[PDB]
Structure formats: C-alpha cells, structure tokens
C-alpha cells in the first residue's frame, strides 16, 4: 500500500543516509518508522511556516535517531532536501548527527543528551495550556495544539525524565502524548542488565494514562487508535507503549550492534529487495509517497488558513487581547515596558538582591504577560512569586488555573531547566524563569548547557549565591559555579550588586531573544551604590568610580562591589588611589565595542578582581585575582568573609601588593592579546 | 517510659541547638525522632570506632535534618558532645549546617544536596554485598552489615533517587532498608502543590518491598516490626513509609513554617513541659537516657569483640584471602602493584586514550582486588570492562553475581556519581570508576562536588574529551566542562596525551586517598610521545621538549601535545625555537614544589597553552591561550579541527604572534604573582 511505501521510504532513506555518512544510528529510525509514519500524518503543521502558533509539535527525545526526524522532514518538504540528507553528519550540514533547533527546520528543540526532549515536550505542553487559558474564548480555540514526543529507554532511565514525568502528571497535562520506544535494547545489550523496572506500573502511579500497542513493527491503525484514545483522556499525559525491534529489517535487528553503527552494504541490499526498492538505488522518494505527503500538508495548510480567519475574527471580537496576541507573535515587548522597571538612589536602604528580584518581579509581572516562571519549591527563599499571581495548576485540583502564571516545580532542578526551555521552545514570546539556590542551578547542568545552544532565553532566578549564605554550609556554597556558567558559550551570568544593577539584569534577560540568564543573587542585604544605574550597568561593565590618577583600578561583581568601595577608602588611608569597576555580567560586558572595553579595563594601570567565588576567568578582566578557591564554611556569613579575609582591608592589603608588584613594570589592559 | 525519655530528649537536643545557633531545621528532626530512636536501637556500631567494616551504615539523606544526627551520635557517646550541640551551624564547629563526613564523626557521607544520600545508601549496600560476596565463607559472615537510610520528600522528587532508586531494585539490594519522612511538607507547602504521585506504587514498579507505618510519631513498635520485616525480605531492598507531623508538638506542627527556622521560645517551653522537661533548662540529657543508650553500646562492643575473633580465626583458615582482607582494612594497596602498568615507548603504534584506559585496566584489575567499576550504559564506548571479569548482579538474574567486579548502571551518570561515593564511603581501600562520555559528567555535578568535598577517591573514566569525537557534534562535544571541574576545589582532572601518560593518571587515581579523578580520554588515536614517562607524568606537569633558547614555550594537555609537537616543526622552519610542556594533570602539578614548577613555566620566556576546549584557568599557566571558546560541529573530527584551526600551522601562527607580542616585554613566569 502507500502506508506500507512510505514507511520503508522512511526507512531506507535513514538507513542511507547513515550509510552515506558511515557514521550514526539506523536502529531506532528502523523501528520507529511506521510509530513516525502514523504520528505526522495526525499532526497539524506546515512545511512553509515552521512557526505557526497552533501547529502540533513534535519532539525526537531519542536524539540519536535523527536520521528518522530528518527523512520525516524532507518527505513533508521543510526545508530539507534529500541533498542535505546526503550530507548527514558532515561539517556544516544542515542534517547534524544530533537535532540542533537553531540549524534544522522543523526541529522544535535540540537533543541528543537524553532525557531533555522528554521534558521538554512537557514544558511545550505546559506552555500550551497556559496560552490556551489566556487567550481562548468561547467559539475562538486559538490554541489547542497537541505536542507528541518520541523517547526510548536510555530517556526513561535517565532522572530528569522522572522528574518532569512527575510534575507532567500532578499538573494533568492531556494534550501531552508520548511514545516510548519499548525496543528492549540499549548501548550495553538487553535492558535486562540494568533496566527491568515496570515502566508501565511507574507512569501510572505519575498519573498518566496507558496505551499499548504490542506489534508497533507494523500495526499502524493501533498507533493511530493509541493517538485517537490519548485524546480522549483530556486530564492526563498519555504513555503509549510501541513495541518495536530496534534495526527492524536489518539482519542485525534485535541487537545492540544496529542501534549505533552503519549497516553492512549487504543488509542494505536485503531490506531494499524485500520492500520493493532497488538495492542499487540510494536515498529513493517515490512520488506516490511525495504525493500522499502532500495531501496531508495541503490539508494542514487549509487549517492554519482557517486559523488565520480565526485569529482575524478574535481581534475583531476581542480587540485588546488580540493586539497582545498579535504583538507577542511578533516577538516584540509592550511598548515602555522598562519603564515599570525599578530605579534606586544612593539614599535608598540596603536591600538584598533577592528581595530587589522579587519587587522587579512584582513590577513587571503586571506589564508583560508573557512572563512566567516558578520555583524548585524554594518560594519563599527565592522570591520568585508575585503577590496577587495564581499558580498554574489544573483547576480541578482547587490549587490554581492553567492561566496561572508561578510553577510550583517542586524539588525538580534539572526537568525544571528542560521545562523551561520547552516553555521558551512553544514561541509566543515567553520569557520564563526558574528559581533555586545557585549552588543547586548545577543539578540542571545538562539543561542548561541546552538553553545556550539552542538559543533560548530562558532565566535563572538563582538566589543565596555565596558564602554570604552563611550557615548553610559548604554544600550550599557556590564556588565554581559561576566560573562553570561563564566558559559555557552563550551564557549571561549577572550578578548585580545592587537595586539599578537588578534591574538592569531584568531588563537584559526579559529583552533576551537568543542568549539564557543565570541572575546570581545575594542573600544577604548590600547598600545602594553611588554612581550605578540601569543605563551604565546594562553595559555589563561600567567605571563605578573614575579615578583619574589611578594606582590600581579594583574589578568586582556583586556582594564584592561594596567591599571594593569600602576598601577605596582605607587606601586612600594608605596614600594609594583606586578606581573601581563594577562587572555585573561578563558576557554583556565583552559585547560591548573595544573603545568602550578599554575605557573600563584602561593600560597603564593595575587591576585586581575581587570576587567570593573561583578565580577562573577573571584574567580576561584583570592581572591579579583575589577570590576563593576552596569549599566554603558553616557560620554566620560575617564571620565567614572575616576569616577568608574578605574585608575592606583584606582587600586594601591585596591591593598594595599589586600596585608593589607593578611598580617599574609597564602595564597594558588585560583586554590586550597576542591574537 | 526510658524510650518515650530517650525520643523526648532527642527532640529537645536538636530543637535547642537550632534555637542557640538561631538557624536551622526543626521540623524533620521533631518528627523523625521515633524512628531514629527506633532505627538506632536496631544499628550496630561501635562509637568508639566509627570504621568498624562490618558495623550497620546509618545515611541521613534529609540532610538538613542534621540537628537530629547530631543528637543520636551526641547521646551514643561519638566523639561529639553537647558542647558541640551548643556550637551548631558556628564557624568552625563540629556540628556544621549539613552533615560533612570529613568533620563529624559517625557521618558517613556528606549530605545536604537532596537526594543524594539514598543514592549513596545504594552504594554502601552494593559495596556491601559485594564485599560479603567477596570474602564470606562457611562459618564466616566476615560482612553481614546494612544499611538504613532516611529520606523525604525533596529526596523523592530529586530524579537522581528515581535512577539509584530503580537500580537498587533491579539490583535485588535487601540489606538496604530506607525510611521516607511521609510528611506532606515542603519548603513551598503541602505536597499537593507538586508531589502528588504513588510513591509507594512507584517503588513496587522498581521491586522493592514497601512497608507502611501509619502512625510513626508514636508507634516505634511497628518501626521496630518494620526492620524485622525487611530483613526476612533478602531480595528486594525495602521502603518504609514513615507517616509522621513534621514539627511534631510544637505549636507549629504541620506546616512549612516548622521545617526551617528557629522555633518560638514560647514553643520550645511548651514542648518541655507537655514531654516532662524542664522549660528553664537547655541541652537536658537525662542520665537514663545515656544509660539505656550505654546498654545498647556496650553490647554493641561486644559484638564487634567477636567480629575480631572471628576474623582472626578467619585468618587461620583462609590465609590468602584474610592477608587481602587485612590490607584492605589498612588502607593499602597490594605491593608493587603498580608494576601492573603498561609502559609504552615512542616506536609503539598510535591508540585512543580510551583505548590504553582499557589496557590498564584489564592488566591492573586481576592485580587489585579493591578495583570494581562500570559504565552508564556506554561500555563498547568508554571500554571500562576488562574481558575475563563478571558483572555485579544478583546470582537469580543469571546475569552475573555479586562476586562481580563490573557493574551496569544504565542511563543513570547522576545516580552512578553518587553510588560511587557510597561505595568509597563503604571502606575496605575500594577505589571505584564509573565511565560515560566527558559532556556527560556535567549530568552528575551534583555528585561530582561532593566527592570533592567529602574527599571520596572515586575515578570518573570520561572518554570523548573534545570536538577529536567528530560526527556526534556539539551536544556531545566537552567546551566547559575541564574548567567546570578544574575550579572545583579537590579535583584531579587528567587529560593524558599517550600511553605512559594514561598509566600515570591511573596511578595516582587508584592510589588516591582523600581526592576524585576524572580522567579525559579520547576517542581518536594519539602518537606515543618522545619523552614521556610515568615518573615525568606523575608531577602532573613536566617538560616533553627542553630548549634552552626558547623563544616561546607551548604548554598543551591530552590531544593537544602531539600537536604542539608537530608546531615545534613548523616554528623551526619559521626561525622560532619552542619547548613544549605536557599538564595531565593540573591539580598534581599546583602541589609540586615551587622550584619544580619554575623548572617547569620559567620566567623570562612567553608560554602559549593549547587545548581545544575552554581557555579559563589557562592563565595559572601561560601568558595567552589558544583554546576553543564556543560550541563545537558535526563533521569529521579532522575537519573540525581544520575549521577551528587546530593544526601545526595554526598553532604555530598564534605562537609566533606571542612571540611578537612580548618583543621589548619583561616577562615573568605565569605562576609568578602578588600575593
Ligand atoms: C547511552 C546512549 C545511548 C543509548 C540509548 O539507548 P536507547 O535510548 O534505548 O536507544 P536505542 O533503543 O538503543 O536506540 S544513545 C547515546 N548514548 C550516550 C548518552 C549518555 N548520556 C546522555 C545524557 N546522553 C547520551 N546521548
Ligand atoms: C528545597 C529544600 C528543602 C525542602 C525539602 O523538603 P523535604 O525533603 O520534604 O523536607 P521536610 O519534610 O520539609 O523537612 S530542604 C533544602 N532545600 C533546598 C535544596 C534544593 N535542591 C537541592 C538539590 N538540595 C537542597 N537542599
Ligand atoms: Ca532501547
Ligand atoms: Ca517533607
């Protein structure tokens, strides 16, 4: 039949092009192809607007089997073309060996790590439901999209999967609809090795519904009725159990030895042979399947441009809501929505970081809807929620709504960072974060390291960021974390010293459209400072205090930009002049142009760095580094800055050494290289 | 009644201390006093020797609930006194926020970072029944031990217990007998916020057995029945659900409010009273109760009295095995075995250092007994299993028995991090590894800082190091993660470039005592260096190419000393004379001497790193860096590095730049600096 056609299509194109490539994994795409086949011709999308807000979405959480992804995308005529399939795995394709959002249309998300695509189907869920509580109106379903993810059993065992899959079911997100690809083999042979839990048994206990389809290597009504089912359960994620043979086809199906290897060129030729292919032929389409693909998408097309209508006739009826919808499909923020931004002078009280977050949270909540964002049931050391929000919950729990807008993540770190990127995946405009001890952002590192490449601009709200926590201890103590974040590419770690600096952090993560925010914040309360404000601090690096005649300039961050200006002044005390820069983000800060670089970081002048974490780094910035290179303490922070020498004169002390060390040396920035 | 005393004075003890320090966690330590009582009472151990291998091994994972630890060891007569109670969460204190291992005695593991305890309680009793497997004999339970676990809520929802959680089931781990603090109540509220899942149907789809105490802040009768139960069930490790009132009897029971701060002084005088205490009176330990626990102790002494004969007597008749046994318990490892190593010569043919890892370990694993290890289902890829040896499974599966030395852990690199501190935890000198590619470590950071804080000679073999690991492309690609590490305080992170280098990273990780390893390793093949030798390797840093008239040293680690060689060439041609210095380790060759690492960075001569990941922390040790500062491609590795310009000619390029750069520069070595 056609079906039949086009799944060995599918097939044999993914086997060919790992063949092609002599690299990548044609076992998964082989049993996964008729569950593939199946799910797309139930999906709503459009080849020509990877974009439109109502398509279904589709996640590969089994990022190896892109080869599946990629032949899917090219039969539907995204633009991907048999000639990129040719070049799978080669430098610059456009076919890499794992799916990368930002170089592959028609790839919502980018995987490979395990276990991230799976939450992040929750978090395009999540954000659907909320969307869908927003702005639906009666006789106006503006979104009611569904999000179909793909997974195996590596997903399944790694514990961000749990995580997310716990949360998915407690928030009873039924247009959620994974797969998992019950194939019974992994790298290390059997799953009976490692892997014998009752998978099924576990999901419900999450709360979600099961389907099974116990012969998936042909029984596409079964997996199409599995779908139909799955809609029909409107308060629960649903599973579905394709079994599969991992390799179906292959002389090696069944093995671990076809999960992750080319085929022999023989076993190429059998599986051509016996559906109907040439053996002599590579990357074959036939039209009939080209034909069938194509009613689907011009009947998709038809859809998006009834939903078109649709969304004319809402900004009809609901003009206000409407232009928002309309705006935040552009990509743009309100207009002067920095205005609800807070501003502090020097004359203000001392304030932590934390707190100065949660009243910039509290301001611009009301001002831009499309912020949303929760906590890893640290809420009230965060201060992640405004007052007056409700939270996203089902409402039949009596505990929120789904227009909700504070996630009670629970203690959930990493599904919360992959959640979030899902969340940021959906579109619209949302600008969501995430709060937790920074100590704790590193459980969520596999995510994060996602958020920067796959260009999401998502925010961590990561709060008790030092020893200035104090009595916690040293497993709550950053030391590396920010050094850790800082080398990853794409990242902006603000760590704002005081109320203009937070807020220009805000103003820096909410205008984010490529790039994730870490916002490491202070327990503790730290003075307003003279000379910031959000114009100077949103160039990540500013001159806090000019000194003309400078014998050392003082670079810090955060809690240690207070310290500096203390420590200015025991100098001067000394008879030694310091400036001091404040460097509230290192990543904003080298965007900035070379003039305006050097006009902080000037020749001809020592400079120090003063921060309470790791040294890592901070020669871009300076010559010497005065921080911390061992685990923290548990006491009173106070006592803890004392001992580690952390004090006005601690610091005034380092400082002279430097300028002695310099002195009849001649000096340029260490924004100067070789190359 | 002594026992109602006993739980009376627990709960005071650490209700008082969290009122001196002014800080701390009230709530679990109140509501989980009845089954530490109970649990304890059950424990063998000795507090006068806090290494007895075969005690009982008792694992807060609640770790915030420590004020309740440190009363136990307090009142058993540890070495911890009620001075020190008077002293919680003050610097430098006994008694510190969390629980640390390397500063409370009778801590096994540092705790605090949810979720992580239970997964080191898997790996205690892995160790365990491997060690029993080990040396047991007729007549001879040399180890019979087990190990109790408390857990609660935030542990649940932490993923990393899902994956320990589901391999300890399969695992069949019956002398693991964990308690989950079934409270209701986290930071953020009652747990129908966020955590409203089966728990006990999620633990009985991994195969463990459950036992349910409904009234656990009263009845230490059915917690004491529930031990007896999940004894006589040797082949499933066992959850109780305790169902307790966090911040039982305070006025404030029940609510997020009692987990963590101080409780009112009002409060605490009414707890004294209703329980028969003296409200006018702190710290009250009644004599009773120390007599009652002295009982307990006492015949605990004269348990592991006999213990030692048998294990003389073991001796007697087991010659071989109790020699092993003997050092073992000595903390040192079979002489000479180091012997054991491959030694390469520059005539022998190029291979991965992936590839020489499993050399060593195949030649050094029938050599010391204390090695067993595995892989997060990537054993044909990290090649971690020496042919000949058996995996570590329960005997029924048929799969391997507990006598085996190589373990599967499945997709599970947080959980395997964490059961490795369990099992270095266990004692008897094990030094265990764990392998999964170098970007995915990142997934275990949690676990991974916590062997550098609790000094855990764990060793991470961590192959496909850089972009040298081609076609995978970025999401497998390491840029971050050497620097991540390498600012963690108390890691030895090992990138070898060659054969004898990889023996020398082996060296120090196996004979390590107080530090983690992560060895780098390479997926592609690498030349056998001129000059390179394990005594040269293990300083960490050494000289591969001395040129006295250097214009220029190039400091390289792993792949990119061979590369640097071959620049030596092409800066000959270019009249530019270069040494070369191989770093595998960085952490090693800090602790030199400052002579021998002058020897090493002398002043007077510019020095250039080159390696192909991020460039922090390079300047520690060279004036400019050539290193790899964004994300990674999918491509053939060769291609890539062209791309990026790691070839002889672009290394070569960048040194000459650095030459020019410092021509008419004083310049002194990197390790040189002001304080
Ligand atoms: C183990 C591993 C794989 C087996 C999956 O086993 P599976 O899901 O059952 O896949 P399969 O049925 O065999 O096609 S892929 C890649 N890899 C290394 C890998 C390890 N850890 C993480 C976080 N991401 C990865 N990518
Ligand atoms: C959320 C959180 C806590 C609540 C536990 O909730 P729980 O286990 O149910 O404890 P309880 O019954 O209330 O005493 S403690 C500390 N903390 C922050 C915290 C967050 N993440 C990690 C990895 N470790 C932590 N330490
Ligand atoms: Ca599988
Ligand atoms: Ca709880």
């Given at each position: 039949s056609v079906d039949q056609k086009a799944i060995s299509t599918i097939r044999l194109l993914a086997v060919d092009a790992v063949a092609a490539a002599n690299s990548g994994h044609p076992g998964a795409p082989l049993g996964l192809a008729p569950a593939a086949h199946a799910v797309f011709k139930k999906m709503r999308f459009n080849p020509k607007d990877?974009?439109?807000?109502?398509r279904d979405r589709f996640v590969?959480?089994?990022?190896?089997?892109?080869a599946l992804l990629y032949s899917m995308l090219v039969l539907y005529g995204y633009d991907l073309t048999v000639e990129d399939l040719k070049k799978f795995?080669?430098?610059?394709?456009?076919?890499?060996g794992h799916p990368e959002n930002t170089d592959?249309?028609?790839?919502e998300v980018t995987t490979?790590?395990?276990?991230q695509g799976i939450c992040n189907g929750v978090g395009i869920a999540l954000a659907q439901a909320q969307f869908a509580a927003t702005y639906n109106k009666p006789d106006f379903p503006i979104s009611d999209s569904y999000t179909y993810v793909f997974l195996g059993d590596g997903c399944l065992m790694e514990g961000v999967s749990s995580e997310a899959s716990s949360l998915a079911g407690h928030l009873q997100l039924g247009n959620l609809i994974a797969f998992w690809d019950?194939?019974?083999?992994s790298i290390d042979g059997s799953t009976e090795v490692a892997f014998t839990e009752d998978v099924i048994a576990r999901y419900k206990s999450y709360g979600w519904h099961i389907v099974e389809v116990s012969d998936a290597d042909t029984d596409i009504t079964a997996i199409a009725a599995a779908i139909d089912e799955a809609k029909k359960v409107t308060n629960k994620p649903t599973l579905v159990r394709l079994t599969t043979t991992?390799?179906?086809?292959?002389?090696?199906?069944?093995?671990?030895?076809?999960?992750?290897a080319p085929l022999k060129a023989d076993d190429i030729k059998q599986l051509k042979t016996k559906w109907?292919?040439?053996?002599?032929?590579?990357?074959a389409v036939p039209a009939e399947v080209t034909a069938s693909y194509n009613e689907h998408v011009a009947e998709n097309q038809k859809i998006q441009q009834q939903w078109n209508e649709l969304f004319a006739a809402y900004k009809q009826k609901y003009p206000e809501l409407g232009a928002e919808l309309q705006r935040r499909l552009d990509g743009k923020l309100p207009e002067?929505?920095?205005?609800?931004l807070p501003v502090y002078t020097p004359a203000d009280a001392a304030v932590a970081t934390r707190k100065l977050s949660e009243i910039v949270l509290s301001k611009i909540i009301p001002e831009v809807p499309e912020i949303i964002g929760g906590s890893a049931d640290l809420t009230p050391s965060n201060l992640t929620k405004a007052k007056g929000t409700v939270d996203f919950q089902p409402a039949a729990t009596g505990?929120?709504?789904?227009?909700?807008?504070?996630?009670?993540?629970?203690?959930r770190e990493h599904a919360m960072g992959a959640i979030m990127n899902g969340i940021a995946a959906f579109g619209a405009n949302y600008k969501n974060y995430g709060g937790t001890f920074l100590n704790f952002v590193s459980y969520a590192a596999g995510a994060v390291r996602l958020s920067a490449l796959s260009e999401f601009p998502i925010t961590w709200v990561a709060?008790?960021?030092?020893?200035?926590?104090?009595?916690?201890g040293p497993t709550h103590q950053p030391i590396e974390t920010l050094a850790h974040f800082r080398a990853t590419p794409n990242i902006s770690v603000w760590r704002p010293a005081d109320g203009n600096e937070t807020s220009a952090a805000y103003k820096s993560a909410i205008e984010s459209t490529h790039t994730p925010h870490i916002l490491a914040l202070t327990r503790q309360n730290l003075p307003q400072l003279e000379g910031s404000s959000i114009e100077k601090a949103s160039k990540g690096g500013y001159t806090l205090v000019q000194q003309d005649k400078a014998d050392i300039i003082i670079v810090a961050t955060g809690s240690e930009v207070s310290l500096a200006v203390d420590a200015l002044k025991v100098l001067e005390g000394q008879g030694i002049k310091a400036g001091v820069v404040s460097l509230p983000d290192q990543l904003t800060f080298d965007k900035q142009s070379e003039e305006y670089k050097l006009s902080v970081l000037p020749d001809g002048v020592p400079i120090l760095s003063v921060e309470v974490?790791?040294?890592?780094?901070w020669s871009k910035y300076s010559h010497q580094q005065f921080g911390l290179n061992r685990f923290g303490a548990s006491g009173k922070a106070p006592e803890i800055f004392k001992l580690f020498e952390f004090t006005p004169e601690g610091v005034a002390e380092r400082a002279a050494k430097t300028v002695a060390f310099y002195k009849g040396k001649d000096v340029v920035s260490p924004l100067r290289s070789a190359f």
């Amino acid at each position: 039949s056609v079906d039949q056609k086009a799944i060995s299509t599918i097939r044999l194109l993914a086997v060919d092009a790992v063949a092609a490539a002599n690299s990548g994994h044609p076992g998964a795409p082989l049993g996964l192809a008729p569950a593939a086949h199946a799910v797309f011709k139930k999906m709503r999308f459009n080849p020509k607007d990877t974009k439109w807000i109502n398509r279904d979405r589709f996640v590969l959480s089994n990022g190896h089997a892109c080869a599946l992804l990629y032949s899917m995308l090219v039969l539907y005529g995204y633009d991907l073309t048999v000639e990129d399939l040719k070049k799978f795995r080669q430098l610059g394709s456009k076919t890499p060996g794992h799916p990368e959002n930002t170089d592959v249309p028609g790839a919502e998300v980018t995987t490979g790590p395990l276990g991230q695509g799976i939450c992040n189907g929750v978090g395009i869920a999540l954000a659907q439901a909320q969307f869908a509580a927003t702005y639906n109106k009666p006789d106006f379903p503006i979104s009611d999209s569904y999000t179909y993810v793909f997974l195996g059993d590596g997903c399944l065992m790694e514990g961000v999967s749990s995580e997310a899959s716990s949360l998915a079911g407690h928030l009873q997100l039924g247009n959620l609809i994974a797969f998992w690809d019950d194939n019974k083999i992994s790298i290390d042979g059997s799953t009976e090795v490692a892997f014998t839990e009752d998978v099924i048994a576990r999901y419900k206990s999450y709360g979600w519904h099961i389907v099974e389809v116990s012969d998936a290597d042909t029984d596409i009504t079964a997996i199409a009725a599995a779908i139909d089912e799955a809609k029909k359960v409107t308060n629960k994620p649903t599973l579905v159990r394709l079994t599969t043979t991992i390799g179906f086809g292959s002389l090696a199906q069944g093995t671990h030895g076809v999960h992750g290897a080319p085929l022999k060129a023989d076993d190429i030729k059998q599986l051509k042979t016996k559906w109907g292919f040439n053996p002599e032929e590579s990357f074959a389409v036939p039209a009939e399947v080209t034909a069938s693909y194509n009613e689907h998408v011009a009947e998709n097309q038809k859809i998006q441009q009834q939903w078109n209508e649709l969304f004319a006739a809402y900004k009809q009826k609901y003009p206000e809501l409407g232009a928002e919808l309309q705006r935040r499909l552009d990509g743009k923020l309100p207009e002067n929505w920095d205005k609800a931004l807070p501003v502090y002078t020097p004359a203000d009280a001392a304030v932590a970081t934390r707190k100065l977050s949660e009243i910039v949270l509290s301001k611009i909540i009301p001002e831009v809807p499309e912020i949303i964002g929760g906590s890893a049931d640290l809420t009230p050391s965060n201060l992640t929620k405004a007052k007056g929000t409700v939270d996203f919950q089902p409402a039949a729990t009596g505990l929120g709504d789904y227009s909700g807008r504070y996630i009670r993540y629970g203690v959930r770190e990493h599904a919360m960072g992959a959640i979030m990127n899902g969340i940021a995946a959906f579109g619209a405009n949302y600008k969501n974060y995430g709060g937790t001890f920074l100590n704790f952002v590193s459980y969520a590192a596999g995510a994060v390291r996602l958020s920067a490449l796959s260009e999401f601009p998502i925010t961590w709200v990561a709060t008790h960021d030092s020893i200035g926590l104090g009595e916690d201890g040293p497993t709550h103590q950053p030391i590396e974390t920010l050094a850790h974040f800082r080398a990853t590419p794409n990242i902006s770690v603000w760590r704002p010293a005081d109320g203009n600096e937070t807020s220009a952090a805000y103003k820096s993560a909410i205008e984010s459209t490529h790039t994730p925010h870490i916002l490491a914040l202070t327990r503790q309360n730290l003075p307003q400072l003279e000379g910031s404000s959000i114009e100077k601090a949103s160039k990540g690096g500013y001159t806090l205090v000019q000194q003309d005649k400078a014998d050392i300039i003082i670079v810090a961050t955060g809690s240690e930009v207070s310290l500096a200006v203390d420590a200015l002044k025991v100098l001067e005390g000394q008879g030694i002049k310091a400036g001091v820069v404040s460097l509230p983000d290192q990543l904003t800060f080298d965007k900035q142009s070379e003039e305006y670089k050097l006009s902080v970081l000037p020749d001809g002048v020592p400079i120090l760095s003063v921060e309470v974490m790791s040294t890592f780094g901070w020669s871009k910035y300076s010559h010497q580094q005065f921080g911390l290179n061992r685990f923290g303490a548990s006491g009173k922070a106070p006592e803890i800055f004392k001992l580690f020498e952390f004090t006005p004169e601690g610091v005034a002390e380092r400082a002279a050494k430097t300028v002695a060390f310099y002195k009849g040396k001649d000096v340029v920035s260490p924004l100067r290289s070789a190359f």
